[PDB]
Amino acid sequence: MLKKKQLTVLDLHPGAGKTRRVLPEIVREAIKKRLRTVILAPTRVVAAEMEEALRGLPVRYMTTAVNVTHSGTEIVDLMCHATFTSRLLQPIRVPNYNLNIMDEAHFTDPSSIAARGYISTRVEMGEAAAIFMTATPPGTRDAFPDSNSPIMDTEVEVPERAWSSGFDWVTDHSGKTVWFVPSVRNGNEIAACLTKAGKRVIQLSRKTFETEFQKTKNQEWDFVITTDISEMGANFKADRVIDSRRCLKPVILDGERVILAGPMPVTHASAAQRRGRIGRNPNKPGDEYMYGGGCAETDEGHAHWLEARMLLDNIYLQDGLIASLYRPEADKVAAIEGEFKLRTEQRKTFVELMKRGDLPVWLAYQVASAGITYTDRRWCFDGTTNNTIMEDSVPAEVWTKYGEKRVLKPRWMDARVCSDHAALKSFKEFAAGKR
Ligand SMILES: CCS/C(=N\c1ccc(CC)cc1)NC
């Protein structure tokens, strides 16, 4: 695997030992061969689990999720997928790693797709080797792969709202369940229904993941209600997965707005990953997987692939060349390579709106390409009446940095800035000039 050119896809089934068994062997060989190596973790939780599997080995942890006193002589760096992509975009020089290892290489967030694009392009140019570790490579059509122990698979109607009757099997269970819901708001309703029935529930989503995940180890629970973020290496000591088989899909309409379409079917890769949370202990056969819908290729036309192109167009590769998306996932978007390339100043605004502004990639691009500077928030208020953001059935209001009370009405509407209470609160703070 460890030779210039060559991208290897390590596709062992979920729980086969890619992270705890194969990864340390690869790292030992890389260090023996003096290969400058990067290990890409999807989340800070996976970064912490990787330190445990790699303990002793000289690895430089470029994350605050690990508390290690480095020696300065490490030739292996470990960082999150987003950090790698972020450093590539920023003026900081990123080493030209001879070996690029991506754990949970199926992650569909824009920064993970862009990282795959950049790395596979360097490999195609003959400059580096790469290893993509995932049980579900792009384009997988099997939602029921192998497991460490047999799983009972059952197609059943799964509630997506609070219920009074008709789903006794859900609450009659005496074990631990991980339940995948299509959104934070849908999970809040199911969590409330289960709590009212006497169950102890933990909720996980992208924003709360590190803090709330600790509770799955620190306390006794009956249910974990989670969004699709738990498909990325989140390990639970559970005996059942309930899977709605649904997700929200960001869709760019007329090149002018982003809506959260659906809920709609998950991909086969997402279903296999959700199911893959259980059946991991060869001594506990019979873990259950209850699923409530079929799979579909909902990654085609999904905004994340277009956002990945906006990122790759603004990353230096060599002269005017631009990194292409990883070949198996390149047809998911219809885009011209280079169409989102920004001049140095607008590029800096683009980066700062994502990094400091915490805006979605698509929204950051619309603001930066319009020649608007980072601190100029007049665009949050001068959109059409149909772009009015609503808070509890009434127009949302903020005090501008000037001291004026105004209705939140952005020139570009992206549904992700107000898809839950937390997102709308962060967007209100941005529109007010508070970051
Ligand atoms: C706070 C009261 S309004 C204010 N600025 C303006 C000025 C003009 C207009 C358009 C009539 C709106 C707003 N600053 C504090």
Q: What gap in Å lies between CA 24 and CA 58, rounded to an integer? A: 11
Q: Quick one: CA torsion of 429, 263, 43, 314, rounded to 10 degrees?
A: -70
Q: Is 252 helix (H, G, I), strand (E, B) or coil?
A: strand
- Strand 257-265 vs strand 246-253: parallel, antiparallel, or unpaired? antiparallel
Q: 187 labelled as ligand-binding?
A: no
Site to probe by mutation for ligand 1, drawn from 397, 404, 405, 407 as the one with most ligand atoms within 8 Å of Cβ, is 404
**220, 262 contact by CB (below 8 A):** no
Nearest to 13 by CA among 213, 151, 117, 115: 151
Rg (CA), the chain: 22
User: H or E element: which one contains 264?
Assistant: strand 257-265
* Nearest protein CA to atom 4 of ligand 1, as residue: 404
- For residue 404, the ligand 1 atom closest to its alpha carbon is 1
The four Cα atoms 27, 326, 15, 233 give a dihedral, to 10 degrees, of 90
- State this model's resolution in angstroms: 1.7
DSSP string, 200-218: -EEEE-TTTHHHHHTHHHH
State how far the Cα of 161 lies from the Cα of 159, in Å rounded to an integer: 6
How many residues belong to the chain?
A: 435
CA separation for the pair 389, 424 (Å, rounded): 9
**Cα–Cα distance between 289 and 178 in angstroms, integer?**
10
- Is residue 78 within 8 A of residue 47, CB to CB? The reply is yes
Phi, psi of 412 (to 5 degrees): -120, 130
13 belongs to an annotated ligand binding site: yes
Residue 301 and residue 108 in contact, taking contact as beta carbons nearer than 8 Å: no
8 A C-beta contact, residue 169 and residue 299? no
CA of 408 to the centre of ligand 1 (A): 16
CA of 385 to the centre of ligand 1 (A): 19
Q: Is 12 annotated as a binding residue?
A: yes
d(CA 185, CA 205): 11
Tokens of 270: 């997402």
Query: Which residues partner with 265 through β-bridges?
Result: 246
Residue type, 126: G
Q: Which two tokens stand for residue 131?
A: 């290893």
Q: 392 in ligand 1 pocket by Cβ < 6 Å? A: no
Q: Which protein residue has the closest C-alpha to ligand 1 atom 13?
A: 404
What is 265-319 written as a DSSP string?
EPPHHHHHHHHTTSS--TTS--EEEEE-S----TTTT-HHHHHHHHHHTTS--BT
Listed in order, strand segments (DSSP E) in 156-245 are 177-180, 201-204, 223-226, 240-243
Cα-to-centroid distance, 404 and ligand 1 (Å): 7
Which protein residue has the closest C-alpha to ligand 1 atom 2?
404
Question: Regarding beta strands 76-80 and 37-41, do their DSSP bridges make them parallel or antiparallel, or are they unpaired?
Answer: parallel
Does the CB atom of residue 404 touch ligand 1 within 6 A?
yes
Q: Which residues pair with 77 in a beta bridge?
A: 38, 60
Cα distances from 112 to residues 142, 308, 325, in angstroms, run: 22, 8, 11
**Sequence-ordered list of residues with C-beta below 8 angstroms from that of 21, at least 6 positions apart, any chain:** none
Tokens encoding 256: 């002018």
Chain position carrying tokens 């309409």: 253
Nearest by Cα to 201 from 165, 176, 227, 181: 176
Q: Encoding tokens for residue 123?
A: 């490999």
**In angstroms, what CA-CA distances link 257 with 161, 250, 253, 366, 408?**
28, 10, 5, 10, 16
List phi, psi (to 5°) of 224: -120, 120
C-alpha 245 – ligand 1 centre gap (Å): 49
The single residue listed with the structure tokens 């290897």 is: 8
DSSP lists the bridge partners of residue 288 as 152, 240
C-alpha to C-alpha distance for 103 and 159, rounded to whole angstroms: 33
C-beta of 402 in contact with ligand 1 (< 6 A): yes
CA distance 206 to 328: 26
| E strand spans, 284-408 | 287-291, 390-391, 394-395, 397-399, 405-407
Residue identifier of the C-alpha nearest atom 12 of ligand 1: 404
CB-CB neighbours of 322 under 10 Å: 20
d(CA 84, CA 88) in angstroms, rounded, equals: 6
Taking the mean position of all CA atoms in its chain, how far away is CA 293? Answer: 22
| Displacement of CA 328 from its chain's centroid (Å) | 19
Cβ atoms of 79 and 92 closer than 8 Å: no
Picking from 377, 383, 415, the residue whose alpha carbon sits closest to that of residue 398 is: 377
271 labelled ligand-binding: no
With contact defined as beta carbons under 8 Å apart, do 181 and 160 qualify?
A: yes
- DSSP letter (8 states) at residue 5: S
- Residue 82 burial (CB < 10 Å; 0-12/13-18/19+)? buried
